[PDB]
Symmetry: none
Amino acid sequence: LPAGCETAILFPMRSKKIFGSVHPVRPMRLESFSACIWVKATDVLNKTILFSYGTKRNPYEIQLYLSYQSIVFVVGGEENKLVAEAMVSLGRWTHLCGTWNSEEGLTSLWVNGELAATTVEMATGHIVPEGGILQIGQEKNGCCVGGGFDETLAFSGRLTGFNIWDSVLSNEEIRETGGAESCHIRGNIVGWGVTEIQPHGGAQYVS
Amino acid sequence: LPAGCETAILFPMRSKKIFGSVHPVRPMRLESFSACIWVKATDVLNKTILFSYGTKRNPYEIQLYLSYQSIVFVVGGEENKLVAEAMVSLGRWTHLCGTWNSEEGLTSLWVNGELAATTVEMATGHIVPEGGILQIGQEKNGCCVGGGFDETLAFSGRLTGFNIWDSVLSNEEIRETGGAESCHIRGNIVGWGVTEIQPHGGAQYVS
Amino acid sequence: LPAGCETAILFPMRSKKIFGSVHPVRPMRLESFSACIWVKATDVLNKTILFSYGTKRNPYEIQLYLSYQSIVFVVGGEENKLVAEAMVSLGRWTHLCGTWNSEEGLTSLWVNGELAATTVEMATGHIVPEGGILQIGQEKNGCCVGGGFDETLAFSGRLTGFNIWDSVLSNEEIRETGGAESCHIRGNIVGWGVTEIQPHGGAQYVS
Amino acid sequence: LPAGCETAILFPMRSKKIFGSVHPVRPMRLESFSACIWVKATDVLNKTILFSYGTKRNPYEIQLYLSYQSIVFVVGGEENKLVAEAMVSLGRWTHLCGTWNSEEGLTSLWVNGELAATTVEMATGHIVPEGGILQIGQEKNGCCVGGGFDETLAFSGRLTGFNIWDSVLSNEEIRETGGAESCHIRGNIVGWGVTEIQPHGGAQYVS
Amino acid sequence: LPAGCETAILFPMRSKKIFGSVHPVRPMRLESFSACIWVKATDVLNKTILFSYGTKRNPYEIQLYLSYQSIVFVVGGEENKLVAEAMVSLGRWTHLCGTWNSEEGLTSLWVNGELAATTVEMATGHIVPEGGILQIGQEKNGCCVGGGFDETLAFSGRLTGFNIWDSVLSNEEIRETGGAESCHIRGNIVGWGVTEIQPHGGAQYVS
Amino acid sequence: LPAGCETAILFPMRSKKIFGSVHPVRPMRLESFSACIWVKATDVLNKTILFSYGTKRNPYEIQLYLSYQSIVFVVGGEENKLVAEAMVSLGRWTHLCGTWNSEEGLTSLWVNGELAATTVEMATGHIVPEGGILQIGQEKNGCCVGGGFDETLAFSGRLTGFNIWDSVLSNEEIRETGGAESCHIRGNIVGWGVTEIQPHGGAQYVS
């Protein structure tokens, strides 16, 4: 048994240098998906970056950030967004997730297994290419240049359970993955404790 | 071993290169402030520096060192120092901090939220500059060539919860910081777990 | 070698990891500017990076590449670019430089005291921002464990004498820049020996 | 390129990082001494150190620096100093032998044996102490911060042939030290090729 | 685990490179002294060298190891050795320490504060000098370029409770140090956590 | 440049850290041997090491050092040595060669292929084991104890012309080894580029 599945990372603070590198295996070609994470933040900012995907042409491919007391989920472009209202608390484990489907651009947020939002026609029909970079809580520009990254966009807190799916998991899957025994549940695109994750600049794993 | 806190640093040795490097962003032009930090020490010497700040002209710009059974807080230079009498032990947590008024040089000390000593006219008529060097448990001694840091003045023990404000915290404010649920509160000038702190020569973060 | 300038980067071979870094002082915003190069090339592809400025919002602003015996220069975007046809040789010293103004996008590529090419209203009303990245010999790609750059666009052979002025030079100093002892004058924006540049991934100088 | 002795050090760049360190053996107390070095000043600035020695009590124990076509010599304190005017041109071999005598503060300065500057009443009755830190062409500071050292005070070019003597060398010794086959001679306190010289942050030996 | 409740060092496997090096403060010139150590072993071979003070002319001036269930103490050289018979077992913490005196070569060992053996004429007429090399777990030098330290002598397990006193401790001092509240007492010549110790090749702290 | 060979080693300084390491393929149980050395010394203190082969038991197995103007050839201990009175200078090549016969101690020294000294019954009946360490220009002192290599025993200058044989060379062999083009040769037991050698502490390959 997992006996209390607990493996995570370390963010001693938000600096200009600490970062991590994601290294998936299969193409990022995406039209629909699912993804979730258990989080324990310390302090929210004007825009606190948790994770996001980008490309040389579009560094804003995927995105999820917290500003004050709400959640905004962005896809492929700044205009493309999904704001929540009053469902974030500091320093508390929480289940959160959102999804997109190209075929007519559905989007839904889902927290603690509970629907946080519902809305349609975002990134509608768009095709996600593959060839960019994925990082968790950082931007792209600033590698091996002595910082560079905007410290203003960094995050403080704990994270655990990063997993990505090729398809929008049903709402039953949404509620169940929020259960006390969902840590083992690992996605197809990315599996927590399976996909390569190597820290940098002061990141370390914590159990 | 909590002190109303989770993470801290480790100081396994009084070494010649062990020290902590801290790097805020805003300038250190200070006329008044407060700074509270939990401490748990192993052994006590005639003098053991902590968190001091200084300048290439005035390394003694501020200081706080520790004596066998007295605690001396220094501001500006050698001439201006306040001392606690007999309220220091070893291996136990304590809440120590005070404030400075440039206008009249007021000073305070507070052990476990309990006043220690009070006196006036220290660091008055003069301004704390900006851009100096901040460190911990050791003076800004030789750092690159050789260990360069004298052993006698180093520290062994547990320090964390260090933060900096810009104003004098009232007695209620200080006693609140003495509560077990105040770690989340942070100072604007320095936010613990947010401001830059990088360990050197033996310093090691711990949860 | 004829380049009296001692600093002489060598790029011994073309790989996916050999690269360098630069860190100028003052902002890169420029309504008019000029830059130059003294180079000895080993090999040329359909496209061979010389250098290029880049930002996360515009990976390419200024950009160069030897297209076999022809030179192509870039400003603003792929839409704007000037070309020179057959003014190159392999294994021989060569002086290259171009200029631009936002005033009327006036442009005239230069080559060893000759007018390599000319065009009007290139990048007029287009101000390069400040805070971007400049790279030489290669464009902006990854630099992680096995990420790296495009070896095909990597360069091999020696380079030297790179500097930047912040306006459009008149013909007098332009011609004297190719003088027998023009090494001493240094572009204010970039001075060959004042603006720091660091070899990486195998880079080294013939100094 | 030419040089009296083959072994030399290079300063091809000025930044906040490059610097060098020295590790002599004997104590640095001294009431009179003699010292010099051969330099190739590629460029000058408003103010920039050539070689200097300092400590926590006093960073200005000694400073030699140039001001355009003039050379400035400072001992002990900024007010305590001397200057010679309109001899230097960039990138040229030269010899200078400024010295001191605590007995009456007798300080003179030869330029290849021409008494460029000289006066009295400097540090009269003071003795250089022991226990400081030594460097060449740098302002003392902790670069472990990353940077720290001021770029504007950094030297660009080549320096070589540094020596220290326990007493003031007579005029005959001074004019002998500068011979075309004299760069072998070595100071007792600092012996060229015997006393330690550690390039740092980019400094390199072009021996 | 009376000793486990303290910071210590783990040695998971008996390797060719696992060891530690130190850098004490005062010279090691002695004629009498006390010393102790806390150990919990897993496997004992023909020999598992514990530690040994050695100089260039004699590596075996001081030497402690465990021969299966036998505890042999060697002083000066192989000529002198004192053996404890059956006071050691596997897999648990234990207390096994003693003292020596040159004046008449008196030697004695203790187990849990209980005498194990004593003798006379051991290292009489000889003195232990200062400036040698001390290691732990493995016997002699050859760290980086020597290939390593003889594997057969290597040890795997947990060690702690190391202190050095410059006098034969009385029986009361021995029994008090053998108690559970001896963590605060520390040797003046050397002490765990106060005297520099550097892990090498696998050994790491635990707390 | 001279001496025929185009491969040498530079010891720019006599520090506490520089030394030269060798890794012979074959064990060093030598009863008879031969070798040559080509040197230009820079400065000579009371003692100066050329090489010193040493084992743990007898660090003075085979040695060769210069004192002022006098060669000394120690082998196996202080009592056994061979000395040349005033047969050296500074800063020029010289073919120095001495051998040993374990049969009855036939030992001698050849300068520029010219007999310089000879003694008999030196190291008669004393055998050389295998398992020691060969170093050149310094005496084995330790490389991971924070330096300490005696600067007095270090070497300053550049060196080449080192080989080792399994037996004594004849007079014509010695003279040929001293020939004007005695390179394109390697010793029976050690050569150039074949013998594994790694500079450490400030040595440099040259050609």
